[PDB]
Design an enzyme around this catalytic site. Structure first.
Site, PDB file in Angstrom:
ATOM      1  N   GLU A  11       0.829  -1.262  -0.228  1.00 15.68           N
ATOM      2  CA  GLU A  11       0.104   0.114   0.063  1.00 15.68           C
ATOM      3  C   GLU A  11       0.809   1.241   0.093  1.00 15.68           C
ATOM      4  O   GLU A  11       0.153   2.206  -0.528  1.00 15.68           O
ATOM      5  CB  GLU A  11      -1.082  -0.088   1.087  1.00 15.68           C
ATOM      6  N   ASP A  20      -6.266   6.466  -5.220  1.00 17.82           N
ATOM      7  CA  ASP A  20      -5.640   5.181  -5.238  1.00 17.82           C
ATOM      8  C   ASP A  20      -5.897   4.787  -6.594  1.00 17.82           C
ATOM      9  O   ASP A  20      -6.070   5.579  -7.507  1.00 17.82           O
ATOM     10  CB  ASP A  20      -6.571   4.213  -4.137  1.00 17.82           C
ATOM     11  N   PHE A 104      -8.331  -6.791   2.997  1.00 18.03           N
ATOM     12  CA  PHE A 104      -7.952  -5.430   3.327  1.00 18.03           C
ATOM     13  C   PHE A 104      -8.358  -4.675   1.904  1.00 18.03           C
ATOM     14  O   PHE A 104      -8.613  -3.347   2.027  1.00 18.03           O
ATOM     15  CB  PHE A 104      -6.563  -5.434   3.806  1.00 18.03           C
ATOM     16  N   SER A 117     -12.048 -19.879  -6.326  1.00 21.19           N
ATOM     17  CA  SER A 117     -10.834 -19.921  -5.646  1.00 21.19           C
ATOM     18  C   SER A 117     -10.869 -20.318  -4.253  1.00 21.19           C
ATOM     19  O   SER A 117      -9.958 -21.089  -3.571  1.00 21.19           O
ATOM     20  CB  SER A 117     -10.192 -18.347  -5.738  1.00 21.19           C
ATOM     21  N   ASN A 132      -6.673 -19.848 -10.896  1.00 19.99           N
ATOM     22  CA  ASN A 132      -8.043 -19.349 -10.852  1.00 19.99           C
ATOM     23  C   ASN A 132      -8.015 -17.913 -10.293  1.00 19.99           C
ATOM     24  O   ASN A 132      -8.916 -17.162 -10.824  1.00 19.99           O
ATOM     25  CB  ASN A 132      -9.141 -20.137 -10.004  1.00 19.99           C
TER      26      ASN A 132
HETATM   27 NA    NA Z   1      -2.150   2.456  -1.579  1.00 20.06          NA
END
Ligand code: NA
Ligand SMILES: *SCC1=CC(C)(C)N(O)C1(C)C
Ligand SMILES: [Cl-]
EC number: 3.2.1.17
Length: 164
Positions: A11, A20, A104, A117, A132
């Site tokens: 992140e 983002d 997350f 999956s 998958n």
């Molecule tokens: Na980020």
């Protein structure tokens, strides 16, 4: 390596509001503020999340506090979810971190939708699950991050994160 270090790599850390990969207002270590296109709506969410008038900027300690809260909410979310808890309970500790990483990023509802999956992960068919998982919008939109998470499920090691 642990889930906190893994997510920090994936992140990054930004102390001012930014957009983002999807164009949504975010701050800190991947903390989504709002899907609304208004910067004023994002600043209001930030001030509410921090408890002070921030004017769009936070400190490192405040970013880490939001991150600790967000990881804890993802873990408790998995463990309260009837579809995800059995998958989490079946996994080793490294693969559990890969599942937390996906929750997350996407949220619980997005991950519970990867029905095939899930089933392959619960059955420990690691190579088939890896194939998958890659047939997804997730993989096509953020391929480098997805490849690291998929490698983690395929191998049960931190190899995709060592050297970063
Ligand atoms: Na980020
Ligand atoms: S992907 C959510 C999920 C997990 C598991 C327990 C294997 N379930 O059968 C579904 C597919 C609902
Ligand atoms: Cl990526």
């Amino acid at each position: 390596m642990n889930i906190f270090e893994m997510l920090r790599i994936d992140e990054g850390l930004r102390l001012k509001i930014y957009k983002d990969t999807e164009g949504y207002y975010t701050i800190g270590i991947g903390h989504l503020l709002t899907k609304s296109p208004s910067l004023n709506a994002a600043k209001s969410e930030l001030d509410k999340a921090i408890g002070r008038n921030t004017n769009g900027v936070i400190t490192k300690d405040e970013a880490e506090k939001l991150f600790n809260q967000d990881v804890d909410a993802a873990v408790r979310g998995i463990l309260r979810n009837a579809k995800l808890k059995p998958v989490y309970d079946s996994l080793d500790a490294v693969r559990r971190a890969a599942l937390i990483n996906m929750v997350f990023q996407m949220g619980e509802t997005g991950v519970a939708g990867f029905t095939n999956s899930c089933r392959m992960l619960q059955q420990k068919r690691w190579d088939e699950a890896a194939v998958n998982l890659a047939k997804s919008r997730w993989y096509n939109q953020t391929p480098n991050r997805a490849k690291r998470v998929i490698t983690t499920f395929r191998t049960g090691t931190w190899d995709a994160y060592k050297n970063l």
